[PDB]
Each structure stands twice: as C-alpha cells, then as structure tokens.
Swiss-Prot record, chain A:
Enzyme class: oxidoreductase
Name of the protein this chain belongs to: 3-hydroxyisobutyrate dehydrogenase, mitochondrial
Pathway(s) where this gene product acts: Amino-acid degradation; L-valine degradation
Annotated source species: Homo sapiens (Human)
N6-acetyllysine carried by residues: K21, K37, K82, K106, K110, K199, K203, K282
Gene (name only): HIBADH
GO MF annotations in UniProt: 3-hydroxyisobutyrate dehydrogenase activity; NAD binding; NADP binding
From Swiss-Prot, chain B:
UniProt entry keywords in alphabetical sequence: Acetylation, Branched-chain amino acid catabolism, Mitochondrion, NAD, Oxidoreductase, Transit peptide
Descriptive protein name: 3-hydroxyisobutyrate dehydrogenase, mitochondrial
4Fe-4S keyword on record: no
Catalytic activity: 3-hydroxy-2-methylpropanoate + NAD(+) = 2-methyl-3-oxopropanoate + NADH + H(+)
GO biological process: valine catabolic process
Organism, as annotated: Homo sapiens
Domain of life the protein comes from: Eukaryota
Pathway the protein takes part in: Amino-acid degradation; L-valine degradation
C-alpha cells in the first residue's frame, strides 16, 4: 500500500523519510528533480507529475510552500485532480488560506475523493524526529484513516473540525506566538534599559503571569537560554520570512471575517519591516535584536 | 519590636494581618479611619499620621494606590520622613514609577535610613493566603532583613537589584501580560469567527508555541476554563483600572528609558479605552468581551 508524497523541501524531505521508517512505500514528486534523486537512490518510485502520483497512490500527502503552489499541485494542468481515483484520501500539510483549503475540498469532492487540511507546527527538527503537530480539518469519518498516516510523521494529530479548521488553528496559534514573541522582546528590552539583568527578568517572567512559550522555551535574548536561536545569532529555527507569511494569512482572514486584530496587525507589519531590513533569513525571535539599541 | 504599616486597602489589610499571624506588633495608619478600626479592636496601635508611625517603628511597610499617595506618605507634611529614626528599614510595596522609588530612596538616605521598593504580584487572593510575589530593589545587604518581613506575606521574595528594579520587574511583567492577554483574546476571537470551537482552540494554543499564562491559566473566553473571571462575567480578579495604571507606568518608563514598545503602547491605549467604556471594575481578561461583536 504505497503513499504519495508531493513536495520535498526542508520539511517534506524529513516527513517522507519518517514514513519510510514506518515501512511505507512512497511515490514521489517534486518540481525540483534534484530533490527527488535522494529517494530514487533508495528504492522509492519517483514520477513526473502530481497526476502520476495520484495514478499509483490512494493516499497522498502534499507539502508545499505557498497557496499558489498548492492549488497548482491539485488544480493545475498536470495536477492531482487530472488523474485522482474515487475514494482517494488527499492530505494537504501546506500552510495556506483556510478559504483555499475549502475551495480545494469542493474540487476534490467533485472527483469523488476526500480532502483534508493538515498543516504542521514544529519545524525541521520535529519533522526529522517525527514530533510534529498536525492540525486536521475535514469530514471526521475520515480522521481516523488520516491519523494512521500522519501519526508516522507527528507526535500529536488533532482534529480541528471541518475543512479549513486546521489552517485556522495554525494561523491563530502563530498570530498569538508573534504577538507574545514581540511582547517578550519589548518587555526584556525595556527591563534591560531599566537596568535589570536579563537572566533575572526572564526568571521573574517565567514564574509570573507574563510566562509564555516565547519567554520560557525560546527566549529571544542571547545568553538567557541555551539551545535556542538567540544563542547562535538567530541562525536556523523558524524563519522571519515564514512568520511574516503566516501573519499575512492571519491578516487576510481577519479582514475577511471582520475580526479586529490591533496587536496582530502590528505584529504583522513589524515582521514585514524586518523582512526589508535584513532579518528575512534569521529566526523570527530576532525581533529582540531589531528592537534593542546596542 | 513593632512594625509600621501604612495603607490598609484590599491588599494592605490582609498583608498586615499576615504580619500579626507571625507575631509582629503593628503601628497602623490609613487616611480612612474606618479601615483602621478593625486593627484597633484587636490590640494594634493606630496613630494619626505616617510621621507618627515612624516615631514609634524602625521598620515600616507602605502599601499605597498611587505615586502621589506614596510620596505624600514619605515626603508629606506628616510623612514618614518627619520622624524617621536612623537605621530604619522602610519598604514600599506600592506599585509606582521606578524613578520615584529612587527619589524616595535618596530622601530616606539623607535621614540615615534605608529604602527598598517591593511591589507585589498576586492580587487579593494571594494577599490573603500569603502567596504574593515580592520583587525587591535596594542595597542587597538589607535584602535578608527585608525577606524576613516579606516572607510572612508572600511565598516568593526576589531580589531584583538596586532601588527601582523591583518596580521595573513588575512593570515589565505586567506589560508582557497585557500584550499576551490581548493577543489571546484576538487569536481566540479570530478562531471563533473562523468557525473553531473555542475549547479546541484553547487546547491547541496550550500545547503549542502560542501557550501563555493568559491562555492556559486565565483564559479570557467564557466556558473554556473554570475558576477564572471569564467564567463569572469578569467579576473580581485584577481590575482593568489597575492594568491601565500599570501600563501607564510602563509607557512612562519606556519613554524615559527611550525603549520602543509598539505592542506595549497599544496594550496601554486599549486598556485605557476599556476604562472609559465600562470595564474599569471588571477583571482585565474582559478585553475579549471588548473585542467581541455585539448584537445590533
């Protein structure tokens, strides 16, 4: 029983590898043939199009960088829908607009197949270890089937509701993350400028009502925590460009649903600014470096 | 050996009571004589001014609502400073501007006494149970002595550095809380308007990178958590007025230290707007209710 995998970037590659570690035969496609060679050298079937993946696999995982790439992989000239068979399970782990997930779902449904959005949180490390969180939207009858596949690539797989709810949960999490990370940077910087030792203030934040994941798990001030990007000049981690993309999705959804987001809008514009100022390739926690005045 | 206590509001009262539970004789003042009657009925000495407290006690705790009330208690016509004895330990648990704490300390020092700022986090519940956090600034030689008193009233007593650093620590914490509470409210509201069950979204936030104290211990959405103000129409807890005050302090300190606070500023103005729109006596988590679309 082969599984299709489309998109083998910094996330898709380790995700696919974890499926192979669980004994799944794979049918592979990426627009970059060089990203496929690694898997071909190891007995996995590499094909020429997403349609060709659907021709040979009744379960497919798509992992793509953008809304546009995702719709191209499904509705494009050689997209999955051109050759998708009845009763096929299609799981999109791309992070995209909830509304686009819904539109995609309506299209696969016309073909008598099932679509589920399952965007991931965790990053390259969790992708490699198989410790990702999947936030899953779609018909709940199909969740159990999906969980069998996703459980091989992630440690938590959560049913969020109907199609697009996975995207919605992920987008809302990351918006709150950005707000709190910037908040942490702002409070730490103010604290230091007020004459506080950063390590002491982190300690106070982390035993008080200010405690958050940003401050206790991913502190943006160099020297406060080991093993976080601020320890290493903001290398790796979760890229500022990626954070800005996610906040763009939050912003678009907030306008669409007429939800007021004062802090979320500002977080978005701040990370947008950072993209234009040389932070695009730095971990998003670099906002502290953006704020602080040496 | 008696301890002075000035200011017996919703925080001062239970704080003073915990000192009595530890065996400390008290010398009391509050501008409201009615707030003193309770302590007089029980064998504590009530006097007529803060100066009169200083005349009889070599260690004094002040617990006042504002910067102005604090400086009046010290520097006023009948303030501590008029009758303070040398070697006196003076601890201000009021939440006030760090720069004002420094000014007070310099004045106290002229009188050969010691000043320490020890603002509290925890609220009337923690005040009552003795589970307050004290964040303490001042000469560190004096911290151990202070900790003996404060430890009777709080479960954590943390040395933050020189005078004003306790105020600094508390102000930075509350700014980050305001930002995160508003953030949680915004993310929850957006989730709900996107069609998510709030309980589910809370669960997701609380197992992910979005998890904060606001979302996992004090969730602003009614029905998500028991035992938080949102389960109770935002009654009690930590008042919006008080959150706005504290953010005012962060704003002023941010200006003074020239620290850019983009989200902290907006958090401040948002809570300011809430105070003028009926929220001032509701718990600060009512920001969710403030964001929510009302039927019309």
């Amino acid at each position: 029983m082969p599984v299709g995998f489309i998109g083998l970037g910094n996330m898709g590659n380790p995700m696919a590898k974890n499926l192979m570690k669980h004994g799944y035969p794979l049918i592979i496609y990426d627009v970059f043939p060089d990203a496929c060679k690694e898997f071909q050298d190891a007995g996995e079937q590499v094909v020429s199009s997403p349609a060709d993946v659907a021709e040979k696999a009744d379960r497919i995982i798509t992992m793509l960088p953008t809304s546009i790439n995702a719709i191209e992989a499904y509705s494009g000239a050689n997209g999955i829908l051109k050759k998708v068979k009845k009763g096929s399970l299609l799981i999109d782990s791309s992070t995209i607009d909830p509304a686009v997930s819904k539109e995609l779902a309506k299209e696969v449904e016309k073909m008598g197949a099932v679509f589920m959005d399952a965007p991931v949180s965790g990053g390259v490390g969790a992708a490699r270890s198989g410790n990702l969180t999947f936030m899953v939207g779609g018909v709940e009858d199909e969740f159990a089937a999906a969980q069998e596949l996703l459980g091989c690539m992630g440690s938590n797989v959560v049913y969020c509701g109907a199609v697009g709810t996975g995207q919605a949960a992920k987008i809302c999490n990351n918006m709150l993350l950005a707000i709190s990370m910037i908040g942490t940077a702002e409070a730490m910087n103010l604290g230091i400028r007020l004459g506080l030792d950063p390590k002491l203030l982190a300690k106070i934040l982390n035993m008080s009502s200010g405690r958050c994941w940003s401050s206790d798990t991913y502190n943006p001030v160099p020297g406060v925590m080991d093993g976080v990007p601020s320890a290493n000049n903001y290398q790796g981690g979760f890229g500022t460009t990626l954070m800005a993309k996610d906040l763009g999705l939050a912003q678009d959804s907030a306008t669409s649903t007429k939800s007021p987001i004062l802090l979320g809008s500002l977080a978005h514009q701040i990370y947008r600014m950072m993209c234009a100022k040389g932070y695009s390739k730095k971990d998003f926690s670099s906002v502290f470096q953006f704020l602080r005045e040496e």
